[model samples]
Target: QRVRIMGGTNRGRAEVYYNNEWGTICDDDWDNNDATVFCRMLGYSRGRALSSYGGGSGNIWLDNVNCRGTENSLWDCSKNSWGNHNCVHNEDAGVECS
Candidate 1:
């Protein structure tokens, strides 16, 4: 249940490491609120979306994510079943935080 940033400098794609495998989140419903929760989890106070250009490698872990903006972590957001998403690598989501 840990997360990491990949593919960029100040901002990057989101990846989750679970069950010993790293995977990406589908940008299907990715937004600033979701980004905020994720960034805050990484110790950032705010976050924004990055352009649809960069992403990471691995399975598409989360999809259709919906955050309420006040969540403390990505895990507090709603989403499709874990590892049960319909996405390819290119649809991966990215975010920037400050």
Candidate 2:
């Protein structure tokens, strides 16, 4: 599993690589803590989770993420069962970082 940035200069939409495919995350319960961990993993220090930004196409790999703002990776967050979620693409989560 890995996180990557898409469609921005400093920060953009967030996507994950899992099950040999690239997919978006649902914004449900996504917050600064979750954003921080994800951005840090991307080698950045500042991050803000966003739901307004458009969710990318394909499988919504994760949903209902609940982070504690101090995890080393997004995988450390409490979330809905892996690869099992009830969400549409529009609810996809994104992030902005600096």
Candidate 3:
């Protein structure tokens, strides 16, 4: 598994690399804690939630990500199964890391 801030440096849509394909996370329950873990994974000190980045296709890889603000990585957080979600491309999640 891998995560990135696509389309921008330290700021962009949150996408996950899973099952040999790239996909997105839903913003259903996504928030700062979730963003924090992802940013940390991306080698940033911290991060916060942003609105959907606007477009994408294929699988909404994950949904309802619930981070507790202390996790080492977003993948370790409580979340839906791989590629199981009810979100559209516009509901994609993002972050602003610093």
Candidate 4:
């Protein structure tokens, strides 16, 4: 039930807290539409999918995420089963909000 931005303030990697640990989101199907939802949560008017944060530690919580740009939260998007992904940390998702 938690989310955060790391590395920088308007531009940073995205992570979600699950199972008591923070995890990454694979950039597989991530896009601006998906990032818009995330930036919205981060208190931004809009954002771009600038994913690829070197990498991250622990499980990757999301993959192939699909958002319609109107969701209040990232959890409402269509994504892979929590922590069930076939991606490596190198594909971590990130965003640059404005």
Give Cα distance to truth, residue 42, candidate 3, Å: 0.7
* TM value for model 2: 0.92
| Runs in model 3 lying further than 4 Å from the true structure | none
40-68, model 1: which lDDT tens digit per residue?
Answer: 88888878865343356767788888999
Reference-based TM-score, model 4: 0.93
lDDT of 1: 0.80
| Clashing residue pairs in candidate 2 (N, C-alpha, C atoms within 3 angstroms) | none
Instruction: Give the per-residue lDDT digits (tens) of candidate 2, residues 23-73.
Output: 888888888888888899988996899884665897888988988988888
Candidate 1 versus truth, CA RMSD in Å, comes to: 1.5
Per-model TM values vs. the true structure: 0.89, 0.92, 0.93, 0.93
| lDDT of model 4 at position 12 | 84
Which model is ahead, 2 or 3, in terms of lDDT?
A: 3
Model 1 worst lDDT run, 10 consecutive residues: 49-58
| Residue-pair clash count for candidate 3 | 0
Which residue runs does candidate 1 get wrong by more than 4 Å?
Answer: none
Candidate 2 residue spans exceeding 4 A from truth: none
